[PDB]
Structure to design on (608 residues):
């Protein structure tokens, strides 16, 4: 029993982190096989970031201008290319610690672990979610760029995020491992404001199921609702619309607890309308939305 | 910017996890050098746990009755001994992945990361704190026993906790790596109730400092207090008494923000008396107490 915001064990990703320096800029890179992936803004000075022309800036860079250090050993760069907003630095040595891996582009509402790094060294690991506005609420300082987000399915690491920037509002933006930003963000230090950070309804419901499984049941009421009625309330509270696809995904949690998905929706509707009244659910005074239904099953079943 | 409940990178501890089976009981062990540490209740059946005589149960066990598997390879047990509530199984092979390590016994209020494991395989990593009542609020299922808690100082892992049990209230109890339980708990399935789970005041203040550093300042008021006046309020709210030692520990955060420790105490006093009024601090609707002042500095400075 007990329910925690749990990250994946980070070891497989730690063995991939390297330091990439270009000129006076140093950030992190991800070394998989004989390729090091890093944000393309490693070629920029702080001045360049205001209005960078990446193709033009990259012309002034050669393989020897990219310094890649894995631990305390230097890697030889034998090629470089820009793919969208990432650079791919081909090195002469395959990472001997390369885990089985995939590059995946996640959808909003999906969660992943971040291994925050500085100078190619891991500092910490935390769990977060791709917000519906395509930002993440991470913990990143200057030098954290190139830190990655990932999920693990037994022995395969699915890399889904690479850190690139912090918006003026303190929220974070980045790309998948093909260098495409999540959302409309660009790697330029300019006016970029995020859209509405709505609540991930399906994740809140999954977390209410986790609460029932772990003993917190005070919020279960005597009501039910329909998807349309629930969604009228969800819209009012800046919650994402719940679809039949989300109801289907919650099927296994509904089966385990014996609480119909629409009954849990009616409990959530009452929590939105009445508030918590100073009470807590799984040690939280707000409705948590960074656990997917798959995370709740994984944690409550002990998948390794 | 941004502030997350961050765990230490778990790789160094993943390389130490093994599966220990004795008879029909399987749990996790920690392999450091040529010794595997595990809860002594690996020798018990579920029936034995009601009233176990560990010395008597251990007489019926020989080295070959302890099956230790590291990955998919079996380790040879050449000795076994009981130290307090842990067994030390001497194996014929030193763990080649043994990191630099220390065994430390932490004080209540101190935080650490837990690598939750099942069958010797890591499932996840989360951050938690030793509560003032010597319980931890973890996420552990049957089979998680022997999972460890630790802190990392650059390359040295300080192991501080080994999981042994879940109390009937869903909270967790365990030992240090010398096998001594934290608090008054015993490894017997009997009536063991935890004392008051008070709030770790110094950690709440550290987290309010982290909030100020990360932009959340709405709760800063125009007041100050004294340690004695603050403590009269802290007692009323089941918060731990704040000492001059705690004020000294918050000195660096007070210096960085320019907010005197007693002024932050007065802000906390007002939050206790007035509540949050539906507002949040660092995305939380309650006052978080599982970040120490050292954690706030580490995270806000990017220590690797
Ligand atoms: C290459 N160069 C020196 C540089 C310099 C600054 C940035 N920016 C500015 C920027 C670009 S668009 C919006 N803001 C970053 O956002 C990088 N970054 N990422 N996470 C951070 C957390 C704290 C502080 C800085 C952080 C990128 C590159
Ligand atoms: C050896 N044997 C089969 C066994 C069987 C049961 C236990 N107990 C019972 C107990 C002893 S004192 C209070 N309760 C445990 O608490 C072990 N455990 N630890 N974390 C758990 C989380 C969920 C479920 C079980 C969990 C220990 C050993």
């Amino acid at each position: 029993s007990g329910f925690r915001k749990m990250a994946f064990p980070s070891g497989k990703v730690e063995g991939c982190m390297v330091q990439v320096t270009c000129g006076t800029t140093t950030l992190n890179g991800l070394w998989l096989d004989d390729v090091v992936y890093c944000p393309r803004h490693v070629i920029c000075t702080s001045e360049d970031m205001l209005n960078p022309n990446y193709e033009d800036l990259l012309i002034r860079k050669s393989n020897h201008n990219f310094l890649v250090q894995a631990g305390n050993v230097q890697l030889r760069v034998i090629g470089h290319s820009m793919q969208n907003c990432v650079l791919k630095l081909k090195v002469d040595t395959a990472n001997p610690k390369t885990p089985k891996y995939k590059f995946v582009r996640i959808q909003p509402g999906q969660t992943f672990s971040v291994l925050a790094c500085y100078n190619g060294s891991p500092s910490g690991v935390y769990q977060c979610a791709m917000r519906p506005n395509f930002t993440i609420k991470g913990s990143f300082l200057n030098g954290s760029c190139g830190s990655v987000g990932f999920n693990i399915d037994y022995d395969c690491v699915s890399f889904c995020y690479m850190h690139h920037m912090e918006l003026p509002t303190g929220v974070h933006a980045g790309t998948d491992l093909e260098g495409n930003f999540y959302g409309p963000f660009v790697d330029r230090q300019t006016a970029q404001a995020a859209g509405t950070d709505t609540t991930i309804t399906v994740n809140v419901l999954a977390w209410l199921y986790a609460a029932v499984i772990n003993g917190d049941r005070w919020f279960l009421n005597r009501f039910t609702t329909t998807l349309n009625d629930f969604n009228l309330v969800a819209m009012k509270y800046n919650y994402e619309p719940l679809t039949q696809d989300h109801v289907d995904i919650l099927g296994p949690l509904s089966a385990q607890t014996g609480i119909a998905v629409l009954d849990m929706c009616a409990s959530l509707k009452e929590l939105l309308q009445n508030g918590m009244n100073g009470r807590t659910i799984l040690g939280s005074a707000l409705l948590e939305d960074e656990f997917t239904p798959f995370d709740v099953v994984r944690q409550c079943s002990g998948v390794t």
Summary: Residues 261-274 of chain A form the longest helix (14 residues). The first strand of chain A starts at residue 17 and ends at 22.
